[PDB]
Amino acid sequence: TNLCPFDEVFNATRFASVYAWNRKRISNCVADYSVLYNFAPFFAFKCYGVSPTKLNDLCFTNVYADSFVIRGNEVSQIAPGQTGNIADYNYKLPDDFTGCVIAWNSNKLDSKVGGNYNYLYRLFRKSNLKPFERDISTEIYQAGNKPCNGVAGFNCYFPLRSYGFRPTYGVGHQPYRVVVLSFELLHAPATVCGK
Amino acid sequence: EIVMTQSPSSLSASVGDRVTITCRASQGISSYLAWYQQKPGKAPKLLIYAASTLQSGVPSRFSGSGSGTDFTLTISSLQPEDFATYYCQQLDSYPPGYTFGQGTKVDIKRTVAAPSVFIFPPSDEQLKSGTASVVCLLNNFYPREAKVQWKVDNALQSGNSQESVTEQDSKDSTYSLSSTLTLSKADYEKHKVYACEVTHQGLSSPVTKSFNRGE
Amino acid sequence: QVQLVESGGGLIQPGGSLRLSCAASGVTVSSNYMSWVRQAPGKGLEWVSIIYSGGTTYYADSVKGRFTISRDSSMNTLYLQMNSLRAEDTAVYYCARDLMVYGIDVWGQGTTVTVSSASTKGPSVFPLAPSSKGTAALGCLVKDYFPEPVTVSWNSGALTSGVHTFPAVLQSSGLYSLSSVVTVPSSSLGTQTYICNVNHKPSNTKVDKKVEPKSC
């Protein structure tokens, strides 16, 4: 009677950057979705393709827990059929996404006076990300016709950029921890049931 | 939408002065701000990005500062090639737009010069067409700020006049303004005394130049 | 050679369509954030549209449903298709390379777009006669013409000192008006002839108007 490790994902002391988002494969366990429904600062609990009140009555093959950090003005992009720097170049959700997205203001955790430059995001990319694609490449982005050859400068820029979360920032620029739960039911027997 | 309030609209400075231009955002935008320089007939030129980072090639006398809502562009020692118009930009993704500031014109500071005021009645050739254009001239003044009030039989006229200002003269650093009062021929023949009242810092009291229709 | 070269601007009636081009060299259009910025006469810069390197496009509210940004990678060219143009769309249009947090570093020279319902017309030149009452002012009223521009000289270029040719104003009729004045010593009004030379190429109009003191 193993319980699904949801505490390790939400109550994690440190989250990953959006460009290198972490994913926890959850399977063969008893899931308790009652711990999530009504939290304290849960700024977002939008579900797509499935209802929350029916998750306790559904069994799934694999449940993927994606966690990362973005700013408040970018949480609207963590949704099916969205465009922007986060959606196209960091974390993309498919159009037929089945699952829920959870976000909450973590200004009291991920913002330091002076700037928390530890969280990063991808600014430049030649093409858009496929759904659930993770690109951790740090190659010098070529914005011109002259080859870069790993030399930062003009028309050759580092593809990653810092957030610099300061506690005095506005709500939209404050850090938000996002947890995206994907519910998969493919060619498979279901093992992540509810109780 | 974010509203970028930039002040002052214009400022006068001599070579070597320390110039400061202020940009205020409607909401917090952290360090997502840039400063630009533009001269008449040219494309904008990027000076500062990320609020305080100096663009490559820009002289070191330029510097940006501030974060959140209040930002300032600083020219520590103004040079002759720095008399231009400066803009701030919210170079941030949300909320769309990418708004620019209203702009700050930095003109050449010189001694106060009062304008020479001339009034011109409509020509007989134009009255034959059916329209009367009365023109008031403000010649070689400084500073730019000047108020022109038309009076028709002592009735203050507003809404039927347009103005035009020349760029700061390249030799005496003065401005020149024209104001055109347009009426129909029938309305023009209904009144007698036509005057434009000019108020300016170089004038101890408003100067008025007038003519009487048909004299 | 890192530059952006705009073309395609011009005069067009309201409701019409116009396509602007932005030829790039040095900067690869399909690899950058490419934006269109416009600037109406005497106003500030207004952002129009952007296209991400990944294909994402964005538009200002004033141009949504009317403007569509595009690119041709093989040509290394940025485009702006302007449909249902309005009078307020009259502006110089710049294409530029956006570096997001690093600013907008590369700008083009700009192409001018003028949207008006006016028919081409040569100007009427009326004299601004010096008054009867040490230096006197006289000039010419260049009224009702379209489109821009006109050029004004005095005495075939012999008189340049003290000449002020003001920028044109757009009247409610849709036609431009302009005045060019000059200040001269009062002792010369009876001994020196003053003719202003008005040239308006769009209407093939060259007019020479003699400005004299009015005779009561």
Numbering used by the authors:
A (entry chain E): 333 to 527
B (entry chain L): 1 to 215
C (entry chain H): 1 to 133, 138 to 220
What sentences appear in the manuscript?
S is the major surface glycoprotein on the SARS-CoV-2 virion and is involved in viral attachment to target cells via the interaction of cell-surface-expressed angiotensin-converting enzyme 2 (ACE2) with the receptor binding site, at the tip of the receptor binding domain (RBD), in the S1 fragment of S (Lan et al., 2020). Following attachment, cleavage of S releases S1, allowing a major conformational change in S2, exposing a hydrophobic loop that executes fusion of viral and host cell membranes, releasing the viral genome to initiate viral replication (Walls et al., 2017). In-depth structure-and-function analyses of 27 potent RBD-binding mAbs isolated from vaccinated volunteers following breakthrough Omicron-BA.1 infection reveals that they are focused in two main clusters within the RBD, with potent right-shoulder antibodies showing increased prevalence. In summary, we have presented a structure-function analysis of potent human antibodies induced by Omicron BA.1 breakthrough infection in SARS-CoV-2 vaccinated individuals.
Detectable residual activity for mAb 150 (IGHV3-53) was observed with BA.1, BA.1.1, and BA.2. Structural analysis revealed binding to be broadly similar to that observed previously for early pandemic virus (Dejnirattisai et al., 2021a), although the Fab was translated by several Å and formed looser interactions, consistent with almost complete loss of neutralization activity. S309 binds the right flank with H3 contacting G339 and the N343 glycan, which is close to the serine 371, 373, and 375 mutations. In addition, the independent views provided by different crystal forms show that it adopts a range of conformations, likely due to differing crystal contacts, reflecting flexibility in this loop region (also flexible in other variants).
